[PDB]
Amino acid sequence: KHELPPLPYAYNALEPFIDAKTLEIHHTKHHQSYVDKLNAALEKYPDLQDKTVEELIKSLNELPEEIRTTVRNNAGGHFSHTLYWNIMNPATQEYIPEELGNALVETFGSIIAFKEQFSKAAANIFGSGWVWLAADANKKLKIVSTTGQDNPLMTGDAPLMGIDIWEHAYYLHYQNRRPEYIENWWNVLDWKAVEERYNALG
Amino acid sequence: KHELPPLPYAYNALEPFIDAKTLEIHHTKHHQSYVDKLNAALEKYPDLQDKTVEELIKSLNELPEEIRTTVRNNAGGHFSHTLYWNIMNPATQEYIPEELGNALVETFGSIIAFKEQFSKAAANIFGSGWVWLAADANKKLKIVSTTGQDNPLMTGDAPLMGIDIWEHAYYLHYQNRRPEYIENWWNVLDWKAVEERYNALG
Ligand SMILES: [Mn+2]
Ligand SMILES: [Mn+2]
């Protein structure tokens, strides 16, 4: 009963920053698999089908042991990819909303300093994982590195943006040149969507 | 002082099972990086510069905390890739030497049962990792799954063979179709090399 949403844009809409073939496989193979695996697990325990993926992630320890790992990885995967697609947009004029821009400046010193810290954390991921910008219960911002499809919901924070550092996110166009992928990704980040998330925390 | 070993074969020698471009990048970029990073980690510790990769892995808990993780990952990476190249060869008629064949049959029931259990473990890796055939001190065999560049040396076992399940190992030719890469990899496995290692355990 969870469904894979259509992308908010065509599979070739993030060219040349992300290649169409990748965006299509990433969505229709990798993300689809997380949804299908999550659904298979939840079909065994159908009262969980009524939970949001966020509720599942935040209550892993309460789920049946049989499916706990499958749910961590696949709800985590579903959540994380959903956010990734929704914070990207066909390459658009740089405009960082005031509230978010000011908070980044206050926290990291400048926008450039934030981008540098974030880029460096992403370049330093070992194996498969993610780098996030997250806000804690009091809206303080941090950069978080995670493994697998783990995400900041698990540590009680609100993810605002994340970059996928799994090799499938970049290998077809960039191969081992992960820094090139990271640098290019900034061109499709939708600051307005990141701002919407931050703003909602009120 | 740690050096990248040459491949025992041409970059196109495992075609069509492993693509030349992959073998070239996998070796000259990924494996090279593990060597360069291990060397960089050891630069400040001339006493450690004399240790084998194997000695480093077997002693990680005794290494300086400053470098421990980097040594685990990069010594592990150097060890793991060295073994991977050396247990592959241009595809030839499958001949499994008697001693190893017999041990596989005694342990798993049949060669095909072993190949099934091994392939299943490889298909089930979440994120970046390896699957190994390993022997204990008594030449008892087991299949081991690891994360990152971890390897059976770390649990006091002798790795005989391992398949790289990091996405960089297969994404250019197979993309998300990891099972296709796994199935194909059997065609380039050098059972003579695996048997050499097993035989050495005496
Ligand atoms: Mn992904
Ligand atoms: Mn590798």
Author numbering:
A (entry chain A), B (entry chain B): 2 to 203
Give verbatim excerpts from the published study on this entry:
Here we studied metal-preference evolution within the natural diversity of the iron/manganese superoxide dismutase (SodFM) family of reactive oxygen species scavengers. Only a few metalloenzymes have been rigorously demonstrated to be cambialistic in vivo, including some iron (Fe)- or manganese (Mn)-dependent superoxide dismutases (SODs; SodFMs); metalloenzymes that play an important role in cellular reactive oxygen species defence. To study this process, we leveraged the existence of naturally Fe-specific, Mn-specific and flexible Fe/Mn-cambialistic SodFM homologues, which differentially utilize these metals to catalyse the detoxification of superoxide. By combining phylogenetics, biochemistry and structural biology, we demonstrate that SodFM metal utilization can be evolutionarily fine tuned by sliding along a scale between perfect manganese and iron specificities.
In the cambialistic SodFM2 from B. fragilis (b), all mutants displayed lower activity with Mn and the majority had higher activity with Fe, representing change towards its most likely ancestral Fe-preferring phenotype. c, For Fe-preferring CPR Wolfebacteria SodFM1 (CPR-His), mutations in both the XD-2 and water-coordinating H/Q residues were necessary to shift towards the inferred ancestral higher Mn activity. The likely ancestral phenotype was proxied by the closely related SodFM1 from more basal Wolfebacteria. g,h, Single mutants, but not double mutants, shifted metal preference of N. alba SodFM3 (g, Q/H mutant) and Woesearchaeota SodFM4 (h, VD-2A). d–f, Crystal structures of S. aureus SodFM1 LD-2G (d), B. fragilis SodFM2 GD-2T (e) and CPR-His SodFM1 VD-2G H/Q double mutant (f) were analyzed to investigate structural effects of these mutations. The structures in e and f were solved in this study. Our characterization of these variants revealed multiple evolutionary pathways towards metal-preference switching. Importantly, consistent with previous reports, comparison of four protein crystal structures of the WT and mutant SodFMs we determined here indicated that metal-preference modulation by XD-2 and Q/H occurs without any significant changes to the secondary metal coordination sphere within the resolution limits of the solved structures. This provides further support for ‘redox tuning’ via subtle structural changes.
